[PDB]
Swiss-Prot record, chain B:
Primary location class: membrane
Protein source organism: Rattus norvegicus (Rat)
From-to range in the entire protein, with total length: 412 to 840 of 883
Protein name: Glutamate receptor 2
A GO term from the CC aspect: dendrite
Cytoplasmic topology ranges: 185-190
Extracellular-side segments: 212-386
GO MF, one example: extracellular ligand-gated monoatomic ion channel activity
Annotated site residue numbers, Interaction with the cone snail toxin Con-ikot-ikot: 63, 255, 347
Annotated keywords: Cell membrane, Disulfide bond, Glycoprotein, Ion channel, Ion transport, Ligand-gated ion channel, Lipoprotein, Membrane, Palmitate, Phosphoprotein, Postsynaptic cell membrane, Receptor, Signal, Synapse, Transmembrane, Transmembrane helix, Transport, Ubl conjugation
Tissue specificity statement from the Swiss-Prot or TrEMBL entry: Detected in forebrain. Detected in dendrites of neuronal cells. Expressed in the pyramidal cell layers of CA1 and CA3 and in the granule cell layer of the dentate gyrus.
Quaternary structure annotation from Swiss-Prot or TrEMBL: Homotetramer or heterotetramer of pore-forming glutamate receptor subunits. Tetramers may be formed by the dimerization of dimers. May interact with MPP4. Forms a ternary complex with GRIP1 and CSPG4. Interacts with ATAD1 in an ATP-dependent manner. ATAD1-catalyzed ATP hydrolysis disrupts binding to ATAD1 and to GRIP1 and leads to AMPAR complex disassembly. Interacts with GRIP2. Interacts with GRIP1. Interacts with NSF via its C-terminus. Interacts with CACNG2, PICK1 and GRIP2. Interacts with GRIA1 and SYNDIG1. Part of a complex containing GRIA2, NSF and NAPA and/or NAPB.
Induction: Down-regulated in the pyramidal cell layer of CA1 in the hippocampus by global ischemia.
Biological function: Ionotropic glutamate receptor that functions as a ligand-gated cation channel, gated by L-glutamate and glutamatergic agonists such as alpha-amino-3-hydroxy-5-methyl-4-isoxazolepropionic acid (AMPA), quisqualic acid, and kainic acid. L-glutamate acts as an excitatory neurotransmitter at many synapses in the central nervous system and plays an important role in fast excitatory synaptic transmission.
Amino acid sequence: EQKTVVVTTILESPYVMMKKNHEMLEGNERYEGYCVDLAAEIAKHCGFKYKLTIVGDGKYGARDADTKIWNGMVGELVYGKADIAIAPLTITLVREEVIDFSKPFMSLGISIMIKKPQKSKPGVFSFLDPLAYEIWMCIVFAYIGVSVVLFLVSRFSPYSESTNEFGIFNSLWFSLGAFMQQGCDISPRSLSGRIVGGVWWFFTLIIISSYTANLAAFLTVERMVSPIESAEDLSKQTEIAYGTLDSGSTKEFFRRSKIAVFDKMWTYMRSAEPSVFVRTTAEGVARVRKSKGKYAYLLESTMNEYIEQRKPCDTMKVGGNLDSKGYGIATPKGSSLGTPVNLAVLKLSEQGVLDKLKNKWWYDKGECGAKDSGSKEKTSALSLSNVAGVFYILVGGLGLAMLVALIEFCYKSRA
Amino acid sequence: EQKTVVVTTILESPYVMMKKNHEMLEGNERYEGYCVDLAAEIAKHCGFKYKLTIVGDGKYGARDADTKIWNGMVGELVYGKADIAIAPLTITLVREEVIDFSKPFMSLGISIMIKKPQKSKPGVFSFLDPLAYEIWMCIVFAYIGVSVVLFLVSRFSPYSESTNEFGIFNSLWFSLGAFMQQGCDISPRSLSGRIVGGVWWFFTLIIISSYTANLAAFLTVERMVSPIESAEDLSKQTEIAYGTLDSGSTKEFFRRSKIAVFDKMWTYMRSAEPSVFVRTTAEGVARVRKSKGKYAYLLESTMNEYIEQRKPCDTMKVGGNLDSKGYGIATPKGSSLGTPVNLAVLKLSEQGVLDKLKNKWWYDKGECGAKDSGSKEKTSALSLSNVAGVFYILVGGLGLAMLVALIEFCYKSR
Amino acid sequence: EQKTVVVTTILESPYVMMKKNHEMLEGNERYEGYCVDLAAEIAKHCGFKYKLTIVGDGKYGARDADTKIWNGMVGELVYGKADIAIAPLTITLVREEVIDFSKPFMSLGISIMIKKPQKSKPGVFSFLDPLAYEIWMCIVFAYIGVSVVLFLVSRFSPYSESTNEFGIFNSLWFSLGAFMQQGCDISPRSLSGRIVGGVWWFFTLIIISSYTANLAAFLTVERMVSPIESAEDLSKQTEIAYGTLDSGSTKEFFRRSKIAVFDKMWTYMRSAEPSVFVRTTAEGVARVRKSKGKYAYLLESTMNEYIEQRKPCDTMKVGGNLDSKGYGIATPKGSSLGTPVNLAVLKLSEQGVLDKLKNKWWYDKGECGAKDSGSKEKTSALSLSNVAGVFYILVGGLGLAMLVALIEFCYKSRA
Ligand SMILES: N[C@@H](CCC(=O)O)C(=O)O
Ligand SMILES: N[C@@H](CCC(=O)O)C(=O)O
Ligand SMILES: N[C@@H](CCC(=O)O)C(=O)O
């Protein structure tokens, strides 16, 4: 009988996660996730029994401080503690020097995580907005003042009281009709009444003109620039602190890179204090979430798009990928598995099972994915939900007017 | 033997700034800055080891009158206490007489620093602003012309007619109602009157449609005014005092100058009290901040533009450069360093390292809103302070209407 | 006795130019310009007598093509043909290695020349512009059609002709008052007259609104972008061909430079065909001017800003300076003249005479003082020259109305 394969892996969602009944299930059954499905498929094609394990120290693998010793997941392969690795492990030159990688099974880049700056919800009565509350209150007091002054001037000695129609109720209707610019049925024929009319016409002209001009702005623009994605412009500021994972390939990439913007970013990240780095990706996400949008974490696009699709969905991804990298299955130098694993990965990609495994785990759970991306269009029509408050005011006014008419009729009959 | 060289240099930002480690570390770690980088680049081209030392008295200096003794920075070179000087130090003829300068590495002029006024609120009568004054005159004259012509055309005594109700006062009211885009109770009802009406309606159509285009942006202009710009007005007044660094090249420039405006400014500086000079630049900048805008300081554009980047950014540059001068490395007469240092300066300027260090020290470290404030998203609502001017003329008109009514009544009653 | 100094120079405006009477004057008097003044000042300080000459082959000069020989200005200094050079000779490392340069007397950078895309003058009747010629004519025919249809319907059997006031002249006034949205005496009281009225009201609502909306666009922002500065277009497209002077420091700078965009520009300029280079600056300027704005020339700011003053003032400078360089007086290695000449240049700069020379030559003869750069503030008020056409139409209409009234009165009297 052949020896069982000692597979080794790392806990990371959705690649590997705990089963609900891990307290009672068998050691293999405790694990479920994307990598467990892939491992079963590869084993079924190659034909070996296998036993799962979790890496003893939870680090993806990096090179120690010139001691030439390797951290946990690469070390477990190199020092012969494990026989194969199946995990989200990136293909890099320094790893290729010591361990043999298959062809990639997924393609990915580097991406920024940020906390979303809320969403504005206009009220029912939004049309009131382009003028402040104090303006509406002062317009009401001005209307009452003009109405009573015009009555005092008109129904006061022409000597002859008949001459002027402007009782109170008519002066109040005249000034209301004047403010709406909806035309008139009488006009004053006296010097003092004409000066009060002409001043009210000027006030109306300026107030209505400025109201309709501002409306345009409020209804022709509604967007916010947000923190710029361009990493050079991110480097140009210190209000936000950004950091990578500890012992991850992203950190080695920033260390090794000599591109001027990336060298500047590494120079900041090496010299900045306190420690911006974290031990786990979930700790990085939580530290962004708690830090009131003041801190950022650097993480790779396949994990980013998973987190973006999970509640509470308060995160945003900005900008494109900075690079392009593959994940591949790794096996220890000079080992028989390397060729059949290569043919298995090719065959699975050629049938298309790998898309089925991604769909099953990433997007099937994408609860917030309903049309959240929106559009950048600038000529959208208005929609009835924006207007309804005016319809509610109109129908309430028709109800009130009909009630007043009925009580006036009943009183006039009884009186 | 490759002995270490001694550099003499002065603390000034961002040329030479104390690093926080300096309590813990040796002097070459203690300091960082643009001059430290440049000194490293020059040493790496020339190939020698170097030690950085601070000039004892902290003065660039000039030869004292009637004693003819040079003070600190020039003295260190002339008296052989240092091998080279690398600091912001200006090329001048009096120094060229005794020490050898490389080709200049940066160019600078003399500039005025002032404490900026806060942006002013727009005026009370802002609503009239979108149209020029000549338009409002021509509008008034057109209104008078139309009103009198429309009176003259009616009431023409045909071969008795009284149907044309357009007396002068009613014609003047009809024209006013037509311009405000308000309805009126009478209309011309004769051919010539209908021509005059139609033409006034077309004129009105254009005027309004070109004043209501942008009325809210003019209510929210947000900024205006500056106290001085000419860089000459300081010569004409004594209300604001202005002062230069002590012992600096700027002071010698003003002393030597025979330009009339500069000679007048020196004569003021030679006689005004209490002393306008300061012992360091930082003392001058602080004095400008404290003096509530009553005092200005004269300093060279690299300082002005650096200080403008740095918080709190309450200080600002106005006007152009008064003259053009270069900074250059200084070396002691007949020393062998002169030619390899000079060729190193040329090579570094041709490669462009000096531009990279300029951007890195001056401009990357900016923090105030001058770095970017151009988004100008839509101004929310429209507060009462912007509109209050229209309420005052309304209530004045109501008060006048009551006064006119009361005089009319009391006259009619007796 | 003294030995006359052989000064050598190059013809280039405004540094050196031909005197009007060069056919009759002495060989020294034939020349006048900024450098002749400077040369007289330096000679008056140093005290040597001098004789002017013009460099034979007329090139500033650069290291020859692997013959290791030097061309005209540097060669005439090195090989002992001349004793001093006074010209806009740029300080550069390769020249400093063989000849000695004084401190710089003027500062310059590299700048781009482009042909200005003309200007548009608004007409007297600009307010007509937000619509098209064909729309105004069709609005006139629609007004006539509605007027006559409304008459045909109203003054046609109510059975009673008195019932309708809408004779032709009243229908024509009613429809005019309707189109201005200015209100009117009377309204039709019949079904057919009300349908024709309501359709004319709808047409008026849509047409007027559009005009006032588009007026805003045509009344708000008017500007032109021009080709992008800083060689962005020149690096990113081949549509514009850009040349530099031959045997000039600019060409050596582009050859030597290793900055990525500058290296790309040199790679284009070396490989591009036909030859973009020129022998003289005036030829480069002329080649830009004739080439309908399709060709560009690279030249340093003192020339660019001088040429902007010159007629026909159709050139524009775009972008900032690319670098920083000085001109210095040059003297041949070990020559005694270098020590006093350097102090003379310092003294002249320290008194400020060089500013006076620049002001006199560039600015005081800069009589193209139109200074069309203007201002960029968007909140600019309207000006009477924009409006006057409406005032001319108003006053002509008042004159016509008053004449028609006089002829109607005279006919009424004679009839
Ligand atoms: N896939 C990454 C995980 C760590 C990171 O995102 O930097 C790796 O192999 O190192
Ligand atoms: N660079 C100047 C500093 C003092 C000043 O700005 O006047 C000098 O050499 O003295
Ligand atoms: N000032 C330039 C002239 C030639 C050019 O503009 O390229 C030089 O000294 O070479």
